[PDB]
Amino acid sequence: ERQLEAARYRSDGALLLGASSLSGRCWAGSLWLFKDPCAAPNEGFCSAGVQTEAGVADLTWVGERGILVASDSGAVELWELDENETLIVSKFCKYEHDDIVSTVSVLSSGTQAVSGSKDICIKVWDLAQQVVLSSYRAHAAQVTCVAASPHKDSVFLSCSEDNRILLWDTRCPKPASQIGGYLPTSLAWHPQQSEVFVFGDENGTVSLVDTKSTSCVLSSAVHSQCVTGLVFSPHSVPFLASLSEDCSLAVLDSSLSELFRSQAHRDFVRDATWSPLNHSLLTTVGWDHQVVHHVVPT
Amino acid sequence: RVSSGRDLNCVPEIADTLGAVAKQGFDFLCMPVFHPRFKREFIQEPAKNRPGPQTRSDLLLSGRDWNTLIVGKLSPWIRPDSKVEKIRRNSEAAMLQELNFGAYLGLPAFLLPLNQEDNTNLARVLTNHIHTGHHSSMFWMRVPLVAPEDLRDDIIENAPTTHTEEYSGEEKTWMWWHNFRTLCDYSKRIAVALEIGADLPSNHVIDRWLGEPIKAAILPTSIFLTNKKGFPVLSKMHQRLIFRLLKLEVQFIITGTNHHSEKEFCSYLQYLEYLSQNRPPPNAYELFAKGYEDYLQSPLQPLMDNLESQTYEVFEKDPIKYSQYQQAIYKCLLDRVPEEEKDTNVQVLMVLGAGRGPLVNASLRAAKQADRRIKLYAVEKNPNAVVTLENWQFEEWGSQVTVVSSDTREWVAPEKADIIVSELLGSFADNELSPECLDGAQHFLKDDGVSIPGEYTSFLAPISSSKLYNEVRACREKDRDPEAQFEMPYVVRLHNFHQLSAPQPCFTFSHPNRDPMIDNNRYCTLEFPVEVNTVLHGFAGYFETVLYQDITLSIRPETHSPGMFSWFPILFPIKQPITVREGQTICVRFWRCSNSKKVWYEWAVTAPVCSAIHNPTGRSYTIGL
Amino acid sequence: RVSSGRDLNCVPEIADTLGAVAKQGFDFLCMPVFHPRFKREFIQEPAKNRPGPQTRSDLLLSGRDWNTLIVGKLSPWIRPDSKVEKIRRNSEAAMLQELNFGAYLGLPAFLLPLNQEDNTNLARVLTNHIHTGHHSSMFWMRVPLVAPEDLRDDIIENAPTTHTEEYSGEEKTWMWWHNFRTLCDYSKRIAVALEIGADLPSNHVIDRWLGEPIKAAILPTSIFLTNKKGFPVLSKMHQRLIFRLLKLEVQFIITGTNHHSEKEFCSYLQYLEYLSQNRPPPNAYELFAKGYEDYLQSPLQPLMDNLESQTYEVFEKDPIKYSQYQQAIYKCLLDRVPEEEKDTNVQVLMVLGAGRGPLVNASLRAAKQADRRIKLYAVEKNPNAVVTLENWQFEEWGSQVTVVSSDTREWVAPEKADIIVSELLGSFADNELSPECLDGAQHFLKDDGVSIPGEYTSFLAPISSSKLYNEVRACREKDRDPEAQFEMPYVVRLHNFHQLSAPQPCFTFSHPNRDPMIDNNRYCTLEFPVEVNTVLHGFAGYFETVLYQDITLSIRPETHSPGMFSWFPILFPIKQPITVREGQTICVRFWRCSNSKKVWYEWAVTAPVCSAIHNPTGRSYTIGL
Amino acid sequence: ESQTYEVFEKDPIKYSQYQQAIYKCLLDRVPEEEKDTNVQVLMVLGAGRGPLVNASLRAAKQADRRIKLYAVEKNPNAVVTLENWQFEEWGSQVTVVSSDTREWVAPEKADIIVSELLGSFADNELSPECLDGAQHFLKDDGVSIPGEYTSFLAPISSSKLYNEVRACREKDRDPEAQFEMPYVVRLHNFHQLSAPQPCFTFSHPNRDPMIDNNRYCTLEFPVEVNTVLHGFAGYFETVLYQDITLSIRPETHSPGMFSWFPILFPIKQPITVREGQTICVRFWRCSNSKKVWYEWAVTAPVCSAIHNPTGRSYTIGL
Ligand SMILES: Nc1ncnc2c1ccn2[C@@H]1O[C@H]([C@H](O)c2ccc(Cl)c(F)c2)[C@@H](O)[C@H]1O
Ligand SMILES: Nc1ncnc2c1ccn2[C@@H]1O[C@H]([C@H](O)c2ccc(Cl)c(F)c2)[C@@H](O)[C@H]1O
Ligand SMILES: Nc1ncnc2c1ccn2[C@@H]1O[C@H]([C@H](O)c2ccc(Cl)c(F)c2)[C@@H](O)[C@H]1O
């Protein structure tokens, strides 16, 4: 597994890595836990490691010991670190989607998750009951990104290759609503203004949108290629880490101005996780098998 | 009976996956040739210098498994019609890279999706791959009956799904395909993989695909209902569509995930097999013509050419045709000779164009059951068939039959006929030149003589068939007009086509013919009302004949003689296909032309648009006199 | 094993005769279609009005039997070249009547005799049967090795048989055939039925038939000697001719009455099966050639085209080719690195055009055998083959092999090479453009670096083969020059041909190229002594390559590497056959031409007659740069 | 051929525009305080028989600036004219170079490159490839004259022209290859169905790391009449230097310039178009290492086949 797909820091600072082999003889995936982020991604120096039967398109921490994974086989899978946190064993593997599950997001309560897929469907999951509560054929093309509301279970965002950014509220009879330019590729809810979000497009542009007066507030030509990710810093006045297929990491302020720029990666930058311990430390992983630990000038 | 494939978008280990698919009973596997998520960069650094092998090795499977079991697929991220220039350029290099790797592997088919209106650059890139090297492989365009945008759930508050009917708009994915294959110059290597959704569209949407080259039908697991004992089944409306696809011999593809885990994945395939074994039983015509489906042949010219022995044998194997002829002569003998003249009045029967002798034996069988006296004359110009007749005469018939080795138009008959019996008709009734032959024989028929058949009429019907139009297109030859193939009729068992309007009569001939002037030349205008949106490619031709009073023969589908499988319909192509919208009228013009040497047809379309006059002066096709 | 037939001029009852023939073991029956003695009239009264059936009926055998078991026969009285006009006129009508009846019957072959010098009108009447109606049938011309006049007993007192050797006179029956097939315009439907006699002529006479389309060999029962047990046997010279005929897969025919009475009749067939089983055994080169005999193919262009995975697989299946390459690399390392430097010296080896890695594996086996250190670079411009190389490098080779996905003429190498190894040669040595590819790699070769191969030379030989001439002629295509097929080389496993002179070297290339300016363009003149009377139809091409010192590869017949059969010879045809008399010299000219985009050959014959210059400026054929 | 150069040289307007473009550039590059010290290296790429060398001489006399000319030309037949001109009139001032601009290893670097490598469809004579190969020897602040060029397409109707193309059928080739290649024609009896819209543009010098002279363009032409579409007229516009320009686009045509006629891209089958409909055309500029070609398709109101796929009927030699 050379292609690093995801990097997520948990509360204490343990770094979770998601990886897959996108070439060569075998096309499988792997999950890893590094209680020492500096030893990443060396397999001989990890705390926990598992080999999944298919690739890892997306993942999310579920609490502190649970790992929800979007698989290439069309399954949504839940893994669980044991008592000692030395093994990552499987709890459920449910094949409900009819194609690659490309995106996954844990809803506010940590009791439900929203999955998105190349099969055009968005599913809501009850993690404990291990079943699908709702399936929405809302888009007209591959679901690119699904991002749950930081505080409401019935609220979440979706974007797709059909050029639609949908704002969902499952309390309405028609849950989804279209939000007001190229195809939407990434979504990130603001952690402070919980009625504001950012989205990245396939042309490199990053936009700031307001949920109430939905008509797009600010936009910046950040990248020369597709925006793969937008991750907010743990600061009270947070910074936005934007990552791209242009193999570069950017760090923006609140006016979307570039403060930091890292061209350390030699391949696609897939994820970015800000450390809970040092808020100026941001970790990015890429298809070049590099785990790059950055020191953002906050 | 059912050739099936498994569509996967996840193949962790190809030998392992192929072993499981084969175990499940599938004949083939559609899979990605590169990892579907492995986006590659061809222009910008540092992503363009990505090391390592770009995909798995060709050594993983044997050459025969690559040639027979694997159908490649284009990576979902490849978007040659993207509105972003960079994505478009990267997607063009990636598309050629995937198609070339597929050609390197010797794959028998490669899938490419039509999932939007604009596919111009996808078509240009595929046309370019076709015009490079000498690979020769099939291309399968994945195209749904219903676009995703038109089958979505009505759950977007500020974008409602329109519940009003839009006739043309419901056929949009047909236009997707039509434009794509028009841009690709009707390549015979480009075909349709029709994707079948959960809720079938209106009949007119399903019928847009009649005549289209459908090579595959994609059945997702999510469309299957669950039966009494929990096994996957399909709706009755879906089942009928399955039966149509079985007739075209399509390859069924199962896509999606296993949603019937309690019954395993081969259950979906086993249900398909059940519909295949228990399909509505076919007719004897379907049993007979098996092998001749849309195979173009030249219409026989038994006047100009001497038919071969085995050609006579195939046309003689028609019990219905000869029993109708026997019944026609039987009835005529009774109507001519009353019981008080049962011995005194001998009837002079002249079989004109006797062949190897099936009509002479029908004339004998009709005289035994009618208990009438007959004097037979078997006239035949083919000296090869006359050998058969003269051996029959010497060994069985005797003095009763006089075999004449001559053309009916030259023969100076010693006696006059009470009845003339002939089989000088073709699939378009007068295309074998029966009027000219029987006209030349009228001088020796009694002033009260009966011709059997007494009348014949040809029928035309406008048809749509991109498969047939491509078949005619392939009949181009050296040393002749490069478009002469479209200016001549073909005899073909029409299979994958759509009849756009009901057959209307074209040309009729009555025998004997009184009217002083004769003139076997004709001119006919026909107006066909079309109730569908379609593409006109030619006209199907048929015939009806009155042997004697209520005894008749027909190949006009609606009145077809039960059991008569000999004559196939004829097809008059047109050089350029014509777009026709619902409610429009197709107006065709047919002329039957002739000089002292040859007879021919000429034809033009005059509405909704004009075509050129086809076969002017018989420049590409004539029937020898 | 031996496909046989029975020739009869007496068939009293067709089914009984057929059954008897089939009981004896014959696959087919040559018989008359009309009674041989039944002379017919077409012009004069009263004999023209002869009644009854003119022959047996077609209803006597199934169409399947007429199509596979009967070979028709021209009646011995039919003489279209008679000096008597009446006989000439009747014979034309009867010849058409018979050929037409054979076509009516669907006979797979029809025999016609060439038993005199002039058959002009026989040819004209056959050509006109071929241009009338619907075809497929084969015409077997019954022509004797020795004319009856030349083998008659010397028992005429006032007309002695000539005892003088007449070189061309003894070959007169070949000219009977040649003139006939020249008049009939080399019809593919016209073949030879060669008749063998009691006395065989000189080898030159037999050799006249090399390259001719012999489809049958007629063995009369009177030519068989009787062994001590009463069994029919053949002379050792006749047995040699039979082995020659088995190589061409001719159908053997037994004509004449049974002359081994107490020894039954199937004994003639038993003897043929005996010679067939006890023939000189085919070699390993003959084992692999099966099915490829005289089948024309386009020579591969690995620089212009990306070879397919299965093409790489056939060219790797040559153990002789790679054992020679390994031996050449092994010997070279020893000459470059002495034993005292075995651990401190690293040899930079570069495989240029590595394909799927067989030369990389051979380099690895040679460095281990020699106990020397090598640093490998595998250069390959086909990105699909680079996939195979990179999956090999990751799994087995490791860092020792650096895989370079590039064209050798563009690569900016990070180091110089001690040895360059390549297999960029084709069937005519430089036809894949190895000179231009290795010249482009010379800048990164050490001033004292070795090239494997270091040298290659193409060879040419004039050939006769009317069979290959007709295969080339059939390659006419639309949308191109009607003669382009004669101005391009073909890779063909030459089988039915005559080599008319020993191969001679044509073009030679050395690497590294010490000669400044040098130029890969060539002009060569060759003079080929010919000792036979013949017809030239083209030139076979071959090659020899010196990998290193005395380690060589060759496809030149006299120096052929035994066991290496991946490469078949090339064929450079000519537009028009050229007559060559014994003692004459054939002089050919060959050019190797080029610009910055293309390379091609041009050629002309200048003696004994000139031809046009073939492929001027690569108008019909170029090799892509 | 000699007489072909003679017909294209007979254009006083074209050469006076070129003279004015070089005159303006010399002033903008060399201030009055450097009138003698700064000699300007002018490289005429594709000098022909010498009308641009004389325009470069006429522009240096009226601008009163010092120039060192290099007349590069690959046609050895035209080089004979240039070398006789050099010996008899120009002298040491002009260095005649017998080479392709893409191969020439220049001794010096150019301040200005002057070229006439344009055709009726702007880049159809392969000017982008030729000037791209000459960029290595242009100064880091060098000026290319012309600096820019754009081609223009317009849908046309002409049953007379469609019949003329139809008559260009030949033996030994595709019977429809005549409709898959452009023609240079003085368009007379025709109807322009919609206003010309720009197609492909090239800027010299070209910075962008990737280069790629390949292009793809979609054009939507609004048609206000009922008509029959038979092909597309092609024209060009070029910026020699700032406000000095040349054009064959009818509406902006250079007054007096009669040399270059418009180009015509035919279509295999005529397309019926009703008033209010939009003709949508797609053009691609394609290439390999050996040749460059165009491919084109109509996509509205109805689709046509892609014309000239892979340059099967027409290619421009590199
Ligand atoms: N003017 C003429 N005068 C005398 N005979 C004529 C003509 C023109 C055609 N014929 C013959 O009619 C037969 C008929 O078409 C037929 C009969 C039976 C079978 Cl099964 C069949 F296939 C076809 C053929 O045998 C033709 O040779
Ligand atoms: N200028 C160039 N630079 C880099 N590679 C180049 C060229 C020109 C050709 N090649 C390659 O040489 C190989 C050789 O012909 C070969 C090897 C092995 C087998 Cl079995 C076989 F059939 C053919 C092919 O793989 C070609 O792609
Ligand atoms: N890559 C190259 N390197 C060097 N010279 C090159 C090229 C390509 C073309 N040329 C020359 O440019 C001239 C130009 O087209 C021209 C100039 C003047 C008149 Cl009047 C005219 F008709 C045409 C011709 O003389 C061509 O030979």
Three-state SS at D127: helix
Task: Calculate how far, in angstroms, residue D8's C-alpha sits from the geometric centre of ligand 3.
Answer: 11
Let me know: does A231 contact A188? Beta carbons within 8 Å: yes
Taking the C-alpha atoms of residue C30 and residue C220, their distance in angstroms, rounded to an integer, is 13
Residue whose entry in the numeric block shows the structure tokens 């028992």: C155
Tokens of B276: 């295949």
Q: Tell me yes or no: is domain D148-317 CATH 3.40.50.300.
A: no
- Give the CA angle between residues D265, D267, D270 to the nearest 5°: 135
Neighbours of A192 (CB within 10 A): 12
Taking the C-alpha atoms of residue C70 and residue C137, their distance in angstroms, rounded to an integer, is 12
Three-state SS at B276: helix
Residues in CB range of C541: below 8 A, 6 or more apart: C427, C428, C458, C459, C460, C489, C506, C569, C570, C571, C572
The beta-strand segments (E) located in C68-137 are 70-73, 109-113
Check if A26 contacts C (Cβ < 8 Å): no
Let me know: does D22 contact D114? Beta carbons within 8 Å: yes
Parallel, antiparallel, or unpaired: how do β-strands A29-34 and A15-20 relate?
antiparallel
Based on the number of CB atoms within 10 Å of its own CB, is D188 exposed (0-12), middle (13-18) or buried (19 or more)?
exposed
First-to-last alpha carbon distance for chain B, in angstroms, is 47
Three-state SS at D191: strand
Based on the number of CB atoms within 10 Å of its own CB, is D2 exposed (0-12), middle (13-18) or buried (19 or more)?
exposed
Taking the C-alpha atoms of residue B274 and residue B280, their distance in angstroms, rounded to an integer, is 12
Q: Is the dihedral of CA D261, D266, D271, D277 positive or negative?
A: negative
- CA torsion C512-C518-C520-C526 (nearest 10°) is -110
H helices, E strands: number in chain D: 6, 16
Three-state SS at B534: strand
Parallel, antiparallel, or unpaired: how do β-strands C214-220 and C190-195 relate?
parallel
**Torsion-angle region of residue B36: left (phi > 0), alpha (psi -120 to 50) or beta?**
alpha
Residue whose entry in the numeric block shows the structure tokens 């170079």: D97
**Torsion-angle region of residue A198: left (phi > 0), alpha (psi -120 to 50) or beta?**
beta
Which chains share 3+ C-beta pairs under 8 angstroms with C?
A: A, B, D
Full DSSP string of C156-179: -TTSPPP-S--TTGGGHHHHHHHH
Three-state SS at C228: coil
Parallel, antiparallel, or unpaired: how do β-strands A249-252 and A291-295 relate?
unpaired
Task: Calculate how far, in angstroms, residue D236's C-alpha sits from the geometric centre of ligand 3.
Answer: 18
- CA torsion B77-B82-B86-B89 (nearest 10°) is 80
Residue A188 bridge partners (DSSP) = A198
Experimental technique for the deposited model = X-ray
* Fold classification of B309-452 (topology level): Rossmann fold (3.40.50)
The beta-strand segments (E) located in C33-125 are 70-73, 109-113
Rg (CA), chain B: 30
The conformation of residue B353, written as its DSSP 8-state character, comes to S
The conformation of residue D306, written as its DSSP 8-state character, comes to P
Quick one: B4-297 is in which CATH superfamily? Answer: Divalent-metal-dependent TIM barrel enzymes (3.20.20.150)
The conformation of residue C140, written as its DSSP 8-state character, comes to E
First-to-last alpha carbon distance for chain A, in angstroms, is 33
Let me know: does B330 contact B371? Beta carbons within 8 Å: no
- Which residues in chain C touch residue A25, judged by CB atoms under 8 angstroms apart? 391, 395
User: Residue C12: is the preceding peptide bond cis (ω within 30°)?
Assistant: no
**Which among C57, C308, C391 is the nearest to B53, CB-wise?**
C391
Tokens of B558: 């609606």
Let me know: does D213 contact D222? Beta carbons within 8 Å: no
Q: Is B303 in the pocket of ligand 1 (CB under 6 A)?
A: yes
CB contact under 8 A, A139 and B152: yes
Residue B458 bridge partners (DSSP) = B543
Q: Is C312 in the pocket of ligand 2 (CB under 6 A)?
A: yes
Q: How far is CA D318 from CA C237, C303, C436, C607, D287, in A?
A: 64, 19, 20, 40, 9
Residue C302 φ/ψ, nearest 5 degrees: -65, -25
Taking the C-alpha atoms of residue A251 and residue A254, their distance in angstroms, rounded to an integer, is 10
Would residue B423 show up in a list of annotated catalytic residues for this protein?
A: yes
Residue A9 bridge partners (DSSP) = A15
CA distance B100 to chain C (A): 8
- The ligand 3 site (C-beta within 6 Å) comprises D 5, 8-9, 46, 48, 72-75, 78, 100-102, 116-117, 130
Please state whether at least 3 CB pairs lie below 8 Å between chains B and D: yes
Secondary element (H or E) of residue B482: none
CB contact under 8 A, C481 and D172: yes
Chain C residues touching chain A at CB-CB below 8 Å: 391, 394-395
Taking the C-alpha atoms of residue C595 and residue C600, their distance in angstroms, rounded to an integer, is 9
Three-state SS at B250: coil
- Closest listed residue to residue A164, CA positions, set D307, B149, D28, C344: B149
Tokens of B340: 């008080």
Task: Calculate how far, in angstroms, residue C138's C-alpha sits from the geometric centre of ligand 1.
Answer: 27
Residues in CB range of C144: below 8 A, 6 or more apart: C115, C173, C194, C195, C197
Q: Is the dihedral of CA D96, D101, D105, D106 positive or negative?
A: positive
Taking the C-alpha atoms of residue C196 and residue C209, their distance in angstroms, rounded to an integer, is 12
What own/partner pairs with CB < 8 Å and gap ≥ 24 does B39-45 have? Answer: B39/A245, B39/A268, B39/B75, B39/B77, B40/B90, B40/B94, B40/B97, B41/A245, B41/B90, B42/B89, B42/B90, B42/B93, B42/B94, B43/B86, B43/B89, B43/B90, B43/D210, B43/D212, B44/A224, B44/A225, B44/A246, B44/B86, B44/D210
Secondary element (H or E) of residue C600: strand C598-607
Let me know: does D259 contact D267? Beta carbons within 8 Å: no
Burial profile C525-561: b = 16 or more Cβ within 10 angstroms, e = fewer: ebebebebbbbbbbbbbbbbbbbbeebbbbbbbeeeb
Q: How far is CA C26 from CA C2, C243, C253, C265, C276, in A?
A: 10, 19, 9, 11, 15
Residue whose entry in the numeric block shows the structure tokens 């009293």: C12
Q: Residues in chain A, how many? A: 298
Q: Is the dihedral of CA B306, C34, B404, B318 positive or negative?
A: negative
- Closest listed residue to residue B501, CA positions, set B561, B584, B572: B584
Taking the C-alpha atoms of residue A267 and residue B47, their distance in angstroms, rounded to an integer, is 5
The beta-strand segments (E) located in B428-569 are 445-452, 455-464, 490-491, 498-499, 504-510, 522-529, 534-548, 551-554
Residue whose entry in the numeric block shows the structure tokens 């297999």: C423
Neighbours of C230 (CB within 10 A): 12
Taking the C-alpha atoms of residue C69 and residue C29, their distance in angstroms, rounded to an integer, is 6
Taking the C-alpha atoms of residue A171 and residue C275, their distance in angstroms, rounded to an integer, is 94
Ligand 3 atom, smallest distance to D133 CA: 1
Quick one: C455-624 is in which CATH superfamily? Answer: Hnrnp arginine n-methyltransferase1 (2.70.160.11)
Tokens of B57: 């090795």
Q: Among 3.40.50.150, 3.40.50.2020, 3.40.50.300, 3.40.640.10, what is the CATH number of D2-145? A: 3.40.50.150
Taking the C-alpha atoms of residue B560 and residue B543, their distance in angstroms, rounded to an integer, is 9
- Closest listed residue to residue C353, CA positions, set C303, C390, C400, C393: C303
Residue B451 φ/ψ, nearest 5 degrees: -100, 135
Rg (CA), chain C: 30
Let me know: does D51 contact D135? Beta carbons within 8 Å: no
Tokens of B246: 């079985």
3-state secondary structure chain A: CCEEEEEEECCCCCEEEEEECCCCCCCCEEEEEECCHHHCCCHHHCCEEEEECCCEEEEEEECCCEEEEEECCCEEEEEEECCCCCCEEEEEEEECCCCCEEEEEECCCCCEEEEEECCCCEEEEECCCCEEEEEECCCCCCEEEEEECCCCCCEEEEEECCCCEEEEECCCCCCEEECCCCCEEEEEECCCCCCEEEEEECCCEEEEEECCCCCCCEEEECCCCCEEEEEECCCCCCCEEEEECCCCEEEECCCCCEEEEECCCCCCEEEEEECCCCCCEEEEEECCCCEEEEECCC
- Closest listed residue to residue D308, CA positions, set D317, D290, D296: D296
The structure was resolved to a resolution in Å of 2.4
Residue B624 bridge partners (DSSP) = B598
Q: Is the dihedral of CA C209, C215, C220, C221 positive or negative?
A: positive
Task: Calculate how far, in angstroms, residue D308's C-alpha sits from the geometric centre of ligand 3.
Answer: 26
Of the candidates D9, D73, D116, D295, the residue annotated as catalytic is: D116
- Give the CA angle between residues B146, B148, B150 to the nearest 5°: 65
Parallel, antiparallel, or unpaired: how do β-strands C4-7 and C28-30 relate?
parallel
- Closest listed residue to residue C127, CA positions, set C139, C116, C117, C115: C139
Q: How far is CA A11 from CA A14, A238, A239, in A?
A: 8, 18, 19
Report, in this order, helix, strand and coil percent for chain C, each rounded to 5.
Answer: 30, 25, 40
Q: Which residue of D has its CA nearest to C483?
A: D172
Let me know: does C41 contact C48? Beta carbons within 8 Å: yes
Residue C403 bridge partners (DSSP) = C378
Taking the C-alpha atoms of residue B96 and residue B93, their distance in angstroms, rounded to an integer, is 5
Specify the amino acid at residue A93: C
Check if C481 contacts D (Cβ < 8 Å): yes
Of the candidates B170, B423, B471, B602, the residue annotated as catalytic is: B423
Q: Which residue of C has its CA nearest to D175?
A: C479
Based on the number of CB atoms within 10 Å of its own CB, is A169 exposed (0-12), middle (13-18) or buried (19 or more)?
middle
Taking the C-alpha atoms of residue A96 and residue A130, their distance in angstroms, rounded to an integer, is 11
Taking the C-alpha atoms of residue A15 and residue A9, their distance in angstroms, rounded to an integer, is 5
Let me know: does D156 contact D187? Beta carbons within 8 Å: yes
Taking the C-alpha atoms of residue A104 and residue A71, their distance in angstroms, rounded to an integer, is 10
Q: Residues in chain D, how many? A: 318
Three-state SS at B27: coil
Let me know: does A110 contact A148? Beta carbons within 8 Å: no
Give domain limits for chain B.
4-297, 309-452, 455-624
Taking the C-alpha atoms of residue A72 and residue B9, their distance in angstroms, rounded to an integer, is 8
Three-state SS at D207: coil
Residue whose entry in the numeric block shows the structure tokens 């516009």: D237
Residue B527 φ/ψ, nearest 5 degrees: -115, 115
Q: Which residue of D has its CA nearest to B80?
A: D216
Rg (CA), chain A: 18
Q: How far is CA A64 from CA A30, A235, D242, in A?
A: 18, 21, 66
